[PDB]
Ligand binder design. Structure first.
Ligand SMILES: *SCC1=CC(C)(C)N(O)C1(C)C
Ligand SMILES: *SCC1=CC(C)(C)N(O)C1(C)C
Ligand SMILES: *SCC1=CC(C)(C)N(O)C1(C)C
Lengths: 56, 56
């Protein structure tokens, strides 16, 4: 059988902040910013640093 | 409160193939190839396409 290996890396596209009353509201704002820009992706949220990442 | 959003992308750094009796052998082979090339990362496997990915 033939098997394939893809080697992949991660790259930084961008960084932004926003003011929101809570993390849930910030997530909806950021999902809009990232997804009206058409790119559904993988989300993380770290509450200690109030930071979301999206990998799209 | 201030929230941050880091936007990430994916990069294709390489691709190889190998011939093997089964997926478990292919994985060992590919891990050797990765380790020889100082590629360290997270592994996935998609049986439908017989493709491993390693993301660094
Ligand atoms: S390069 C990362 C990657 C590999 C594959 C499984 C083909 N993918 O769908 C993505 C883009 C996640
Ligand atoms: S944006 C790609 C990326 C994700 C994370 C794991 C947060 N990183 O440290 C980098 C900047 C490599
Ligand atoms: S030999 C391929 C392999 C590597 C490691 C991650 C140590 N494994 O558990 C297997 C045997 C799948």
């Amino acid at each position: 059988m033939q098997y394939k290996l893809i080697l992949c890396g991660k790259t930084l596209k961008g960084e932004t902040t926003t003011e929101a009353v809570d993390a849930a509201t910030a997530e909806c704002v950021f999902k809009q910013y990232a997804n009206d820009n058409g790119v559904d992706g993988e989300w993380t949220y770290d509450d200690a640093t109030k930071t979301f990442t999206v990998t799209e």
